[PDB]
């Protein structure tokens, strides 16, 4: 299947005293593998998956230097943006940055992305071709002109189409035991009588990886969405995921209803019936 | 400002007297400052950990808060959340069938 | 590994 490497950076200004709170995380697919937290004593990029621990001292020194440099870019930007938007020095504000690369089943470059937000709204992002910018407002349009003059898109594209893919392929090979393993959902159905006349059927999917899944109810082989509920996909805490879908039915008619489960780890979709 | 969504659930299906993990998943909120407590019979549980802060496609944040626990027939569990969007803390009770 | 090029401010 396809794979991704994604980094997520958050800075929150502290106007009463000191430098912004800064948190960085890295993922391969739905697996976190590194973190940096400005409030931690180490002041180092830290491992969060066993397969990254084999990287030598030169890796941890370089990643620490670069993630600190990212935090100083955010600190300067929080001051600049306060000015662009004519805001007071009293309030706390937020910058968020996400970037990374996707590869196909062939492990070759498919697409890249680079996106920035101020106070939880779009500011500036690379377009799909990684050769131009989407600016949301006239502050971001001034940033777009500056980054055009400085050839920033070409510098990011070199990483996203090149370096980013080389590292993702290294991690997929080193972490094969887990990163290349699919965990199909463990499925079951439960029944709950509301009254003497109506019942709830709940279709469970447990301990699955990756997170992407589809649960659908049918009545007499036709999709049903009325009288249904479905929770958002949630983490188990052990690296796997959970979801459920439920339908309310007339007591005695349970056999008309089927739950359909689609997942990367299933060669064919599953059908459950009470 | 976006108010947190809250789910409270066990890692494994709940059986009385068998060791497990209690989860409070908070998502879809902005800004990122948040207070989350896990409660046993209304009292705050002390040894609670959380995931590293991350965010979704729409820029909203999410976190998992978790602790070891042993469910019983009588003991009640809940998650208590405070955020700038809430006029008082929100308490969601653990339902073992959800 | 993170972006390995030159950084730019808004």
Author numbering:
A (entry chain A): 1 to 274
B (entry chain B): 2 to 99
C (entry chain C): 1 to 10
What's the publication's text?
T cell activation is tightly controlled by the clonally expressed T cell receptor (TCR) via direct recognition of its cognate pHLA. In this study, we solved the structure of a newly identified TCR in complex with an HLA-A*02:01 restricted melanoma antigen-A4 (MAGE-A4) peptide (GVYDGREHTV), hereafter referred to as A2-GVY. A2-GVY is a key oncology target because it is expressed by many tumors, including esophageal, head and neck, lung, ovarian, bladder, breast, lymphomas, and melanoma. Site-directed mutagenesis together with structural and biophysical analysis revealed a novel mechanism of TCR-peptide selectivity whereby the CDR1α loop of the TCR could sense the chemical properties of peptide residue 1 via a molecular gateway guided by a conformational change in HLA-A*02:01 residue Trp-167.
Binding affinity measurements of the GVY01 TCR to A2-GVY containing a G1A peptide mutation (the most conservative mutation possible) demonstrated a complete loss of binding. To explore this finding further, we solved the co-complex structure of A2-AVY at 1.35 Å. A superposition of A2-GVY in the GVY01-A2-GVY TCR-pHLA trimolecular complex with the A2-AVY co-complex demonstrated that an Ala in position 1 would result in the CH2 of HLA residue Trp-167 shifting 1.6 Å toward TCR CDR1α loop residue Pro-29, disrupting the indirect interaction between the GVY01 TCR and the peptide through steric hindrance. We reanalyzed the structures of several other peptide-HLA-A*02:01 complexes with different amino acids at peptide residue 1. This analysis revealed that Trp-167 acts as a molecular gateway, altering its angle with respect to the HLAα2 helices, depending on the identity of peptide residue 1. For peptides with Ala at position 1, Trp-167 substantially altered its position to accommodate the slightly larger side chain, representing a second family. For the GVY01_αwtβ1 TCR, a G1A peptide substitution reduced the binding affinity by 115-fold, whereas the GVY01_αwtβ1_P29A mutated TCR bound with only a 7-fold loss in affinity. Full analysis of Ala mutations along the peptide also confirmed these differences, in that, for the GVY01_αwtβ1 TCR, a G1A peptide substitution was the most detrimental to binding, whereas for the GVY01_αwtβ1_P29A TCR, G1A substitution made much less of an impact. These data demonstrate that TCR residue Pro-29 was directly responsible for indirectly sensing the peptide via conformational changes in HLA residue Trp-167.
